[PDB]
Amino acid sequence: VERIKTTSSIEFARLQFTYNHIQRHVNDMLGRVAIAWCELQNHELT
Amino acid sequence: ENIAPYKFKATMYYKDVTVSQVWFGHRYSQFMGIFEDRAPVPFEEVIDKINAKGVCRSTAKYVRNNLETTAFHRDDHETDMELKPANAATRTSRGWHTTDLKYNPSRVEAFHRYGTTVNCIVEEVDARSVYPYDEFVLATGDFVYMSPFYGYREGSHTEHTTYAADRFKQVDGFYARDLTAPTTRNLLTTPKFTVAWDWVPKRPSVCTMTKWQEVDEMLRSEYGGSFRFSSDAISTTFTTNLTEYPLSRVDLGDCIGKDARDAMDRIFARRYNATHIKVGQPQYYQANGGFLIAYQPLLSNTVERIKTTSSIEFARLQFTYNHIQRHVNDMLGRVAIAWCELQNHELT
Amino acid sequence: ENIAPYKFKATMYYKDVTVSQVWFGHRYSQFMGIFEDRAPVPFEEVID
Amino acid sequence: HTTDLKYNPSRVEAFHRYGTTVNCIVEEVDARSVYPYDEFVLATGDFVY
Amino acid sequence: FVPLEVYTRHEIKDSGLLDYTEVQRRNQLHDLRFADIDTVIH
Amino acid sequence: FVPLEVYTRHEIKDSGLLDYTEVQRRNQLHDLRFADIDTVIH
C-alpha cells in the first residue's frame, strides 16, 4: 500500500492539451497542403 | 478580490501588575508563586494624564473576576510616574514604560512576604481586521470584539459591538502629544487593556476589491455573445458577459470608482494626450474567475462578494491559444484561397 | 490527493476551577493571585 | 455554563482570604484529524492523543 | 479555457491542521461566553 | 511574456490576519524592552 502525492499546479496538463490540439491541427493542415502540392506537381507534369 | 486585511494603527494602554510571593530561608530565598495580570488604564487616565502630561498614575483600579481591585506600585502611596522610552529592539514599535525593576519584598526570616509591582505601559501596535470587519486584532495577539468603525457619529452605532455601552467612548477634537490637528478617538477598555484608535467612516476606508493591474491598451471585442478583453502587455484574455456589472451589487465597493477614474485619467494624460479621445463613461464588467474589469473606451482622431481564482493560467492559456488560432487560421485561409485561385487559373 | 483534514463534531465537558486570593486593605482590595484550572467531568457525571 | 459570577471572598480586614469558583461548562466543538489519523484536535486548541 | 486549480487557496489554507487565528479567536471569547466581564461585586 | 501573479506569495502570507511567528517574536521581546533581565538585587 502507498499514498499518492498530487502536484499543486495543473498547468502542465493544460499546456499539454493546448500544445496537442495545436500540433494535431497544424500537422493535419500541413499534411493536406503537402499532399495537394504533390498532386499538383504530378498533375502539371502533363 | 482583495484578501489582505484592513490594516491601521492603534495604541494599547495597560498596567502589568505583578504580585510575587517569596520565602526567605536561612541561607537562600525562593519564589513560591508569581501572579501576573494586565490591568486596563481607565478613560480619564488616558485623557488627563497619558496624553496631556505624559505621566501615568502608578496605581491600578480594575474589575477582575467580578471584583474591584487596587494595586499600588510598591504597596506605597499613589504617585505619578514619568513615562519614558523603553529599550530598543529590531522590528518593534515604539513602547513606553514607567518602571524596569520588579519590586520584591525585603529579606525577612522564614515568613513569606508579598511584593506588588505596577508597571504602566503604552505601546503602538498594528491592528488588522477582516471582512465583514466585525472585530479586529492587535499584533500582541489580544482581541477586541467590536468593529473598527463603530462610533456614535453618522449612525455608526449600527456596526457590531460585543461589549456593553459604557466600555466604549468616543472623544472629539483629540490632540495627541507624543510621549518622547484635531482627531476623533475611539477608546475601549476590555478586561485586559485599553485600546485606542482614530475613528474613520467605514465605506470610504475599506474595499472588497484591489486594483491589480493597469493596462494601457486592452482590446475589447464581441464574439459568440460575450466580450473578450485581450491585452498583450500581460498576454491575457478575459471573457465577460455582454451586459455590464453595476457597482451597486458589489459589497463595500466604494474605492472602485475612485481608483478606476484616477488610473484612467493618469494613463490618458501620460500616453493618449492628443492621439485619442475618451468615449463615454467608464464601464464595468465581470470576467470568468472573478476579475472585475473597469474599461474606458478610446477613439482615434481619424449585494454580494466576488470570489477570485488564485490561478490566472486559464487566461494566459486562452490568450496564447487565441493568438495562435487566429494567426494559423488567417494563414491557412490565405493558402486555401490561393490554391483555389491557382486551380481556377490553370484550368486555362 | 485529499489534503483537507477529516472533520467531525465533538463535545467538551469541563469545569473551570478558579481559586482567587484577595488582600483587604484599609480602603481598598487587591488580588494577590488567581489560580485557574480546567478540571475534567467524570464519566457517570456525563451519563447520569 | 452553570455560573457567570466568579465568587470572591467577602470583605474582611488585612487577612488574605481565599475564594473558590467552579463553573461547569459544556461546549460543542469542531474536531479535526490528519493522516494517519493517529490523534485529533479541537477548535479550542487542546489535543487528544 | 476555464479556470482550473488543483488546490484552491482556501483548501491550502484549510490543510493546516490548526490555525493561530481561529484558536486565538476562540480562546479569548471564553470570558464573554462563559462568564460576566462587567458585573462588579462588593 | 512577463511574470504575472494574481497574488504574490508575500500577499498570501500577509492575508493571514495574525501570525504566530510575529506574535511570539513580539511577546518575548517584552522582558528585554520593558524590564531589566540582568540587574540582580540583594
Swiss-Prot record, chain D:
* Region of interest (Involved in fusion and/or binding to host membrane), residue spans: 11-18
Q: What subcellular locations does the record give?
A: Virion membrane; Host cell membrane; Host endosome membrane; Host Golgi apparatus membrane
Q: What is the effect of changing R17A?
A: 70% loss of fusion with host cell
Maturation and modification: The cytoplasmic tail is phosphorylated by the viral kinase US3. Phosphorylation may be linked to a down-regulation of gB expression on cell surface.
- Give the protein family: Belongs to the herpesviridae glycoprotein B family.
**The protein's role, per its UniProt record:** Envelope glycoprotein that forms spikes at the surface of virion envelope and binds to the host cell entry receptors MYH9/NMMHC-IIA and MYH10/NMMHC-IIB, promoting the virus entry into host cells. Essential for the initial attachment to heparan sulfate moieties of the host cell surface proteoglycans. Involved in fusion of viral and cellular membranes leading to virus entry into the host cell: following initial binding to its host cell entry receptors, membrane fusion is mediated by the fusion machinery composed at least of gB and the heterodimer gH/gL.
- Stated name of the protein: Envelope glycoprotein B
| Part of the whole protein covered | 248 to 296 of 904
From Swiss-Prot, chains E, F:
Q: How is it modified after translation?
A: The cytoplasmic tail is phosphorylated by the viral kinase US3. Phosphorylation may be linked to a down-regulation of gB expression on cell surface. ubiquitinated.
Q: Where in or outside the cell is it found? A: Virion membrane; Host cell membrane; Host endosome membrane; Host Golgi apparatus membrane
Source species, domain of life: Viruses
Report the coiled-coil segments.
Answer: none
The annotated subunit structure for this chain is: Homotrimer; disulfide-linked. Interacts with host receptor MYH9/NMMHC-IIA. Interacts with host receptor MYH10/NMMHC-IIB. Binds to heparan sulfate proteoglycans. Interacts with gH/gL heterodimer. Interacts with the host coreceptor PILRA.
User: According to its UniProt entry, what is the function of this protein?
Assistant: Envelope glycoprotein that forms spikes at the surface of virion envelope and binds to the host cell entry receptors MYH9/NMMHC-IIA and MYH10/NMMHC-IIB, promoting the virus entry into host cells. Essential for the initial attachment to heparan sulfate moieties of the host cell surface proteoglycans. Involved in fusion of viral and cellular membranes leading to virus entry into the host cell: following initial binding to its host cell entry receptors, membrane fusion is mediated by the fusion machinery composed at least of gB and the heterodimer gH/gL.
Q: Which family does it belong to?
A: Belongs to the herpesviridae glycoprotein B family.
The protein in question is named Envelope glycoprotein B
Q: Which organism is it from?
A: Human herpesvirus 1 (strain KOS)
Read off the lineage from the record: Viruses, Duplodnaviria, Heunggongvirae, Peploviricota, Herviviricetes
